[PDB]
Structure 1
């Protein structure tokens, strides 16, 4: 199952290439200007087979709850209405989002007590690092 080590409250400590990633997502300038300044808190909890990922920033909050491998409807921070699925591959929590024939991936894994989120969209690769708070 998903590592309990994922469970808890995390906070952004580093972001590489987030602007280009958002740009690839078609994000608007207003949301980009703020997304580049934002240092979100990610809270991850799990109950039975139900997992929740909550994102909090002074600018925008998001929350998704899901079961591994079961596609669900998601509304992203940038107001994308996507069909999403989260899977587990070698202890890496992998989210795929599909919309308008397009596709993006967010892979979250633990690295020396840190959580690393790699965001991919059309050759643009973003790395956001979180610390456990």
Structure 2
């Protein structure tokens, strides 16, 4: 189930991602150009239940990172966008993956799936919604 996410991905499309980042209160300097950012993801999994994801943030800041979690187990995150007290939990909803972050009383959601070969993520903060899609690297 998670297996279909594993691999290396490069951005292909980005939609309203700068306004999304602006919507979660991310700094202007970090929100500006958000759809021009080219992250590379390195996704792996273990026992069908734990996942690891290394991100190479790429130009210009190279805020490279990694997250490790278990499906269901809430964990603490320290996001590029500079928020605090962030608790995140990831769970399978059917064949989609659902990622929820909570901080400062607030809630944002990330829904990721596979769509004609592309890893597609819909980001939701309120009714501010962004979409980005990744194609296999480099194939």
TM-score (norm 2): 0.89
Q: How does 1:1-133 map to 2 (within 5 A)?
A: 2-48=1-47, 49-58=49-58, 59=61, 60-81=63-84, 82-133=86-137
Q: Which runs of 5+ in 1 are unaligned?
A: none
The CA deviation at 1:84 is 0.5
Query: 2:15–2:35: 8 Å Cα contact kept in structure 1?
Result: no
What CA distance in whole angstroms lies between the structure 2 residues aligned with 1:54 and 1:3?
Answer: 16
Unaligned runs of 5+ in 2: none
CA distance in 2, matches of 1:7, 1:93: 12
RMSD of aligned residue pairs (Cα, Å)? 1.2
- Deviation, 1:34, is 4.5
Alignment: residue pair count? 132
Q: What is the CA distance between 1:3 and its match in structure 2? A: 3.1
Partner SS, residue 32 of structure 2: helix
Over 6 Å off, 4+ runs: none
